[PDB]
Amino acid sequence: LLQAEKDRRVLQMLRENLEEEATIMKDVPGWKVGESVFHTTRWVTPMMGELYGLRTGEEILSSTYGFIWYT
């Protein structure tokens, strides 16, 4: 159940964040909207910036650094 919850949550962040990207970069030339970094086509494991980018400081700070130096 935790596995499937993490799945739905990271797919939600990926879909909404590619929509964020397609909104925010759609004026500068070059830049295909959602092409892969890699030459193959598999589910690459993300990096906590593909998920947690531009979440304005506090959210990424409590996400990526909470377990390290708190509780």
Partner 1 sequence: PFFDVQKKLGVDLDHWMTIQSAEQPHRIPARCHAFEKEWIECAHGIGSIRAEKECKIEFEDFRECLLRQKTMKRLNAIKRQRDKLIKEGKYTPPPHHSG
Partner 2 sequence: MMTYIVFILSIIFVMGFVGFSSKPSPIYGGLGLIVSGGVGCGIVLNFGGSFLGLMVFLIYLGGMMVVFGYTTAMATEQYPEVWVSNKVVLGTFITGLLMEFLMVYYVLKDKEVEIVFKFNGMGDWVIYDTGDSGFFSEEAMGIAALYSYGTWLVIVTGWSLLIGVVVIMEITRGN
Partner 3 sequence: PGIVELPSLEDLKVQEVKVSSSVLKAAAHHYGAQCDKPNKEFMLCRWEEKDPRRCLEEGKLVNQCALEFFRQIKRHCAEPFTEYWTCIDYSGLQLFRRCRKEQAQFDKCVLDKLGWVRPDLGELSKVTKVKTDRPLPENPYHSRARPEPNPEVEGDLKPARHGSRLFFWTM
Binding-site member from 43, 67, 69, 70 for partner 3 (CB under 8 A): 43
Q: How far is the CB of 10 from partner 1 (least distance, A)?
A: 16
40: left (phi over 0), alpha (psi -120 to 50) or beta: beta
Q: Which residue has the tokens 């397609």?
A: 22
Is 71 near partner 2 (CB under 8 A)?
A: no
Cα–Cα distance for residue pair 32/22, rounded to 1 Å:
9
Binding-site ranges for partner 1 (CB under 8 A): 16, 19-21, 23-25, 28, 31, 37-40, 42, 44-45, 47, 49-50, 53-56, 59
